Symmetry: D2
Subunit: 377 residues, 4 copies
C-alpha cells in the first residue's frame, strides 16, 4: 500500500444500483481516511454524516439561450478539472464509459495534470448500444484510454469484450452492501401498518419498473404461488411499466394481493418483513436489490441473465430460472414458502457466501488495491 | 366548402417525412389563400417564397437555472395560445399524438377559445411505446380529445387501434409530394461529378440510418446485385448506423461501390440519376422517400412493413419483399436492371398510380374537407 | 374542517427551499393521516420513515429518437393524471406556476375529474421573467386557472401582482422548518474535526452559489469582521460562483479563514456550531436557510431584499442591511460577536417570534384550511 | 499557400449569424475545391447545390433511459472523431469556445491524430458568462488549447481579453455576406402584397427578439419617425420579446404601422423593399443583419455596442447612436428619409466600404491564410 489518496468520484447519485455503489464506496474510502471528492450534477445523495475529508461538489447544468442542449458533459468535466487543480487529486473513479469516463478523460486534459483514471462498467454502455450505435466509438475510447477498467460482474466483462471488441483488460470487482445498513433481522411491526396479516407470506421485488425487469414474469409467478399459499407481493419502485403491470394484476385477479408501494428511501425495513426476493430480469449485470435482500436474510429467486447467476448460487444460496419461466419460478417459490428446512439451509449458505464474496471491506480493499496499482504504473 | 380558414400547424420541421409533409401541406393551403400559421421551436424550415398569408412563429426553448429540463411542451403551448388569441385561429393541425396533440389541447385551454384540433399520426407514437409505456395514457388522450384524427396509411390506423385500444375513428389520408419539386426526368450531368460512369446502374437509399431502416439488408442486397451488374449504391442521409454500415461494406468487399454521400438538401437531383430506390424497413408507416423517387420515375423495391405495401403495388408499380429477404430483393433488382420491358411497364403504371392516389391537390382537398367537417360539428 | 384529504404534490424535490418545503409539508399532512401522493421526476427525496398513507410516484423522462427535448411536462402531467384516476385524489398542490401549475391543469384535463388545484409561488416565476418573457402568458394562466394561489411571503405576492398584472388573489403563507430536525442547541464536537478552535467565532452562509446570493458581499463582510475578531466563515453549498468566490478570498487575503465545505445533507449540525448566519441576497422571496439557522439559535443578518425583511425583524430578532452594504453588515456582525447582551436579547426574541409566525403546525393548519376552502367552493 | 485542405466545420447551423457565417464560409471553401465536412447535430442547413467535395455529417442526440441529459457534447465529439479517422482531416474549424472548441479538442484526442483546431469567437461565450460563471474555465481552456483563435470583430477580441484574462492572441476576422445572395437592388412588387403603399417609407429590423436587441428602442424610434413621415416598420423574426413588443406598439398607438411578419427564409427580398435598417442592440459583436441590408443598398442606423461601430462608419456609411437613444435615432432616420442627397452619399460610401472590408473573397482568403499558418507551425 502506498497510502492516503485524493480521489474524485463521478456517477449519477440517483440512478439505480450504480449510484448507490459509487456513493457507498466513496463513504467507505473516506472512513479509512482517504480524501474523497464527489463531483456530480445538481442531484441529491444519501450521506449519513459529514466527514472533514469527504466533499460533495455539485454543478448546475443550465441551458442559456446559447446552447441547443444543456451542456452536461462539458460542465461536469470543467468542474472535475477545477477540483483536480484546487485539491491536487491523485486519481478519478468514473462510473460508466459514457458519459463519465469521457468526462474524466476531458477533465484530465483541462486540468494539465496527468491524473490516473479508473472506470467502472455497470452495463449501461451495453444498454445504450442496444438502442443506438452512435456512441460505440466513444464507449470504446473511454474504455481504452482509462488506466484501469473494472466491471461489476464477470458476465459483464465478457459481454463487453464481445460487443465492444477491445483487448483492454477488464477487472471484475463485485458489488457490495454496507452491512450496518442491512441488519440480518426479521420484523413484523411494519407488516400490520401495510395491511399484511402475520400468517401471510411476503414476496418482494424492488426495481425501476423498466421492461428489462420482466415484472410480468414476477406477477405471473406470484399468481401461481397465490393459488397454493396465502401471500402478498410487494412491488417497490416506480417507472414505465407501472400501469401495464397494475392492469396485469387485474387480469390475473390478484389485484388485492399485489401492493404497489411506490419509491422508498428505506428499503431494508421492507426486506426485513419479506420472505422471498425476486429479480427475473432479461438483462442484469449484478442486481443490487438481491444482495440487499440476501444480506437481510431473504432467500432469492433470480433469472439466469448476466450477473444474477454469479450472485445466486443455484441450489446452494437460492434458485436461478430461465428468463420468462414463471412455471419454474413459482415451483421454487412454493417450495421455499412451504419448507422451513430448505429455506433455513439456503439462508445459512447465503449469509456465509455473501460475507466471503461481497463484503464491503473486502470489495473496498479490491478497489483500493487497483487504485494504487494505477498510481505505480 | 365553408371557405377561408385560419390554421395553426405544429410539427418538428426538421424531422423526417412528417416535417416535410406538414410544411408542404401548409404551403399548399397557403397558396389556395388560407391563412396559415406555423408554430414550432427554434428549428429551420424550407419555404420557397414568402406569402403575406403564411407566417412562421418560432419559440425559443431555454432552460434557466429554474427548470430541470427545457420546457418545450409548455413553451410551445403558450406560443400557440398567443397565436390563437392574436389572429383568431379557427383550428389547429398537430402532427404526432405526443407531444403536439397534447400541446394543442393545452393551448386551446390557455387561449380561452374552443378551437378545433386535427391530429395526424405518423407512427412515432407506436415507436415511442416500443421503448417505454410511460406515455401510453397521453397518446390515448391526445387521440381521443382531438376533434379528428388522421393517419398517413391504413396500416397505421389499424396498428394504432390494436396498440392504443381506442374506439376513436382514425381517418387514413395518404402522404404526397409536391409535383413541381420532383420532375419526372433523368439526368447524368451530376453522375460524373460523383464518379459514376455513364454505363453504371445506380441504386439509391435515403434515410435517417436508424436500425429500423435495415440498411444491412440494403447493403446485402446490393452486394448480390453487384456480382451480376456493374453498379453503385448511393446512401443519402446520416445517423446511428453509419459506422456499422460502412464496416459492413468492407466485409462484403463492396466498399468502393457504396457512396456515403451524407445529408442532402436537394434529393430530387440524386433521384434523377438513380435507377432503383430501396426502402427495406422493419417498420414504416408510409415511406416518403419512395414516393419522392417514384414521382421522379425511379422504380421501387420495398419491404412489406406497414404502409410500404400500400405505396407500392406489388408486381404492378414495383416489388415488395419480406423484411430481411435480401435474396428476393436482389432477384427483383437484377431483373429490373436487366429488363427494360419490365422496368418501363412498372414505371408507367407507377406514374399513373401515384397521380391518382397521392397527388398533392387531391390530398390537400382531403385535409381541407375534414378541416371543414370539424368546424361544422 | 371537512376531514381526510387525498392530495397530490408536485415539486422539484432537489431544488432549494421549495423542494424542502413541499416535501416537509407533505410529511406533516401525512402524519395527521391525510393520504399524500408525491409525483415528481426521477429525482431523490429525503423521507425519514415510510407511512402507509404516503406514496412517492416517480416518472422517468426519456428522450427517444422521436422528441427534440425530453418531454418533462407531458410525462409528469400523464403521471399525475394516472394517480388522480387510480386513487381518486381530491386536490393537487403544485409548486411553481411553471412548470407545475400548468402540469396540474393539464393533468386535471387528462384525468376527467374536476379536481381542485392549489399553486404555491416561490419566486422562481419572477426569476424566469427576468431572463425571458416567453413564459409570461403561461405564468399568468397557471396563476389564474388555479383554484387558490399562495406565496411564501407578502413581498412575493405584491411583486407578482406588479409583474404579472393579474387580479387573482394571492394568499401569503410563510415557510416553516420541522422543529425536531432543528434542535435549539450549540455543539463543538464537530468544530475541532473541521479545524476550528474553540475560541473562534463562526459565521455561516448556506446557498446555491448563484450570483443573486451576493456571496461577494458576504466575503467582503467577513474580511472586515476578521480584522477585529478571530473567526471563520463557513460556506455551505456549491454552484456557479464557487471559483470566483474562492479567488475573492485570496484577493482579500482571508483564504485560510474561509472554509468551502461543499454540499451537505445535514446542515443542522453546522448551524449548531455557528454564531452568525448571513443571507445578503439581491432577490429572496423567503430565505429558508435563515429560518433553519434561527431555529437552531443562530442570530441572522440579512439584506432587505424581498421576504428577508419579513423573516428578520430588524433590531428585534436580527439585523437587515441594504443590498451590497458590507460596511453596515460587518458593523452589525462585529457587535453581535462582541456583545453577549445584544446577542442573547435578539436570540430570545427570535426564538419566540419564529415559533409564533413560522411554526410547522401553524403553517400546516393554514395550508390545510385553504385545501378545504377549495373543496367547498 | 500549401494547397488543398480537408476541413471539418462545427456550428449550430440554425442559430443566428454564427450558423450562417460558418455554413457560407464552408461553401466558399468548397467552391475553391477544398474538401469540406460539416459535423452538426440533427439541425437543418441551407445548401444551394450539392458538391462532391462538401459533405454534411449529422448526428442524432438521444437521451436513453441511461443519461440524465442528452449527451450532445460527447455525441458530437465522437462523430467529429469518426470523420477525422475516415477522411484524414487536416484541421477543425469550431464556432464558439463552448461547446464546440471543447468538442474539437475532445475529438482530436478520440481520433488519435494531432489535427489542428481553429476556433472562431462570435460573442456567445461572453453572453454565457453574463448569466453564470460555471463555464469560465472551459471557455478559457477552449481558447488556449486551440491552435488559432479568431473573433468576428476587434471589439470582441478586446472584450474577451478583459473578461477571460488570457494572453492568447485572438485574430479579428470580420463577417461577410455572399454577394450573389444579396443583389444591390430595390423592388416594389412585394411591397403591395404586404399592404405597403408605393409612397410609404419602410424601416426594417431583423432579429431573434431577445431583450439584448432593444426592440423597445426601435419601436420608440419608429413612433417618432411616424409623426413626421408616413412609413411602416417591418419586424422580421420571432422570439421572447414578441408579445411585449406587440403591446408596446399599442401603447404608442402605432400598431397598424408595425408589421410583425415572423421568421423568413428569404430576407433579401425584404431588404430590397426597405429604406432603413435598424440594429440598436445593447450587445452585438458584429450584426450580420446590418451587412446583409447594407449589401442590398439599405442605409443603416446602429447603436455603438460592440462591433456595430466597426460595421457602420458613423457619418460616412450610416449613423451610430448611444444604446437607448431613441431621440437621436429618430432624428437620423427622419433626415435619411427626407434627404435624398444624404441618403445617396452614405449609400455610395457604404457600398464601396463593405466591398473593401467585408467581401466574401477577401474574408475567405483571410481564413484560408490562417488555416495554412496552423498547418505549418
Ligand atoms: O424504491 C426504490 C427502488 C429502488 N431502490 C434502489 O435502487 C437500486 C437498484 O439497483 P439494482 O442493481 O437492483 O437495479 P438497477 O436499478 O441498477 O437496474 C437498489 O439499491 C435499490 O434498493 C430504492 O432505494 N428504492
Ligand atoms: O439527406 C436527406 C435524408 C432524408 N431526407 C428527407 O427526409 C424524409 C424522410 O422521410 P421518410 O418517410 O422516407 O422517412 P422518415 O425519416 O420519416 O422515417 C424524406 O423526405 C427525405 O427526402 C432529406 O431531405 N435529405
Ligand atoms: O449544502 C446545502 C445547501 C443548501 N441546502 C438547503 O437548500 C435550501 C435552500 O433554501 P433557501 O430558501 O435558503 O434558498 P433557495 O435555494 O431556495 O434560493 C435550504 O433548505 C438549505 O438547507 C442544503 O440542504 N445543503
Ligand atoms: O427571420 C429571420 C431572422 C433572422 N435571420 C437571420 O439570422 C441572422 C442573425 O444574425 P445577426 O448577427 O444579425 O444576429 P444574431 O442572431 O447572431 O444575434 C441573420 O443572418 C438574419 O438574416 C433570418 O434569416 N430570418
Ligand atoms: C439492468 C442492469 O444491468 N443494471 C445494472 C445492475 O444490474 C447493477 O446492479 C447496477 C450497479 O452495478 O448497475 C446497473 O444499473
Ligand atoms: C419509420 C416510420 O414510420 N416513419 C414514418 C414514415 O414512414 C412516414 O413517411 C413519415 C411521414 O408521414 O412519418 C414517419 O416518420
Ligand atoms: C432566490 C429565491 O427567491 N429563492 C426562493 C427562496 O427565497 C425560498 O426560501 C424558496 C422556498 O420558498 O423558494 C425560492 O427558491
Ligand atoms: C448579440 C451577438 O453578439 N450576436 C452575435 C452577432 O453580433 C454576430 O453577427 C453573430 C455572427 O458572428 O454572432 C453572434 O450571434
Amino acid at each position: 500500500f502506498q497510502g492516503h489518496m485524493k480521489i474524485g468520484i463521478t456517477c449519477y447519485p440517483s440512478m439505480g444500483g450504480s449510484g448507490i455503489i459509487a456513493t457507498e464506496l466513496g463513504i467507505k474510502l473516506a472512513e479509512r481516511g482517504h480524501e474523497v471528492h464527489f463531483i456530480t450534477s445538481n442531484i441529491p445523495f444519501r450521506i449519513r454524516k459529514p466527514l472533514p475529508n469527504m466533499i460533495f461538489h455539485q454543478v448546475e447544468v443550465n441551458q442559456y439561450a446559447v446552447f441547443q442542449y444543456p451542456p452536461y458533459d462539458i460542465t461536469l468535466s470543467t468542474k472535475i478539472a477545477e477540483v483536480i487543480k484546487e485539491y491536487d487529486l491523485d486519481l478519478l473513479h468514473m462510473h460508466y464509459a459514457v458519459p463519465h469516463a469521457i468526462c474524466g478523460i476531458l477533465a484530465r486534459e483541462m486540468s494539465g495534470k496527468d491524473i490516473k483514471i479508473m472506470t467502472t462498467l455497470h452495463g449501461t454502455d451495453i444498454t445504450v448500444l442496444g438502442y443506438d450505435h452512435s456512441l460505440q466509438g466513444a464507449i470504446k475510447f473511454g474504455i481504452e484510454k482509462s488506466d484501469i477498467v473494472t466491471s461489476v460482474s464477470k458476465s459483464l466483462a465478457q459481454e463487453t469484450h464481445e460487443i465492444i471488441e477491445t483487448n483492454k483488460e477488464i477487472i471484475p470487482i463485485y458489488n457490495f452492501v454496507r452491512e450496518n445498513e442491512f441488519p440480518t433481522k426479521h420484523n413484523t411491526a411494519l407488516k400490520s401498518q401495510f395491511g399484511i396479516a402475520p400468517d401471510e407470506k411476503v414476496l418482494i421485488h424492488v426495481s425501476n419498473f423498466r421492461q428489462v425487469k420482466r415484472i410480468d414474469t414476477i406477477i405471473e409467478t406470484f399468481a401461481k404461488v397465490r393459488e397454493k399459499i396465502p401471500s402478498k407481493l410487494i412491488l417497490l419502485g416506480d417507472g414505465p411499466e407501472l400501469v401495464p403491470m397494475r392492469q396485469l394484476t387485474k387480469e390475473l385477479n390478484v389485484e388485492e394481493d399485489v401492493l404497489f408501494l411506490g419509491k422508498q428511501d428505506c428499503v431494508s425495513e421492507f426486506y426485513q418483513l419479506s420472505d422471498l426476493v425476486l429479480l427475473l430480469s432479461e438483462k442484469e449485470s449484478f442486481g443490487l436489490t438481491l444482495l440487499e435482500a440476501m444480506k437481510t436474510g431473504v432467500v432469492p429467486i433470480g433469472s439466469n441473465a448476466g450477473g444474477i447467476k454469479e450472485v445466486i448460487k443455484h441450489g446452494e444460496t437460492g434458485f436461478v430460472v430461465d428468463v420468462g419461466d414463471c412455471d419454474s419460478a413459482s415451483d421454487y417459490a412454493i417450495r421455499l414458502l412451504e419448507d422451513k428446512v430448505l429455506y433455513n439451509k439456503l439462508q445459512k449458505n447465503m449469509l456465509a457466501d455473501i460475507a466471503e464474496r461481497f463484503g464491503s471491506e473486502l470489495i473496498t480493499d479490491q478497489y483500493e488495491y487497483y487504485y494504487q496499482k494505477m498510481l505505480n504504473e
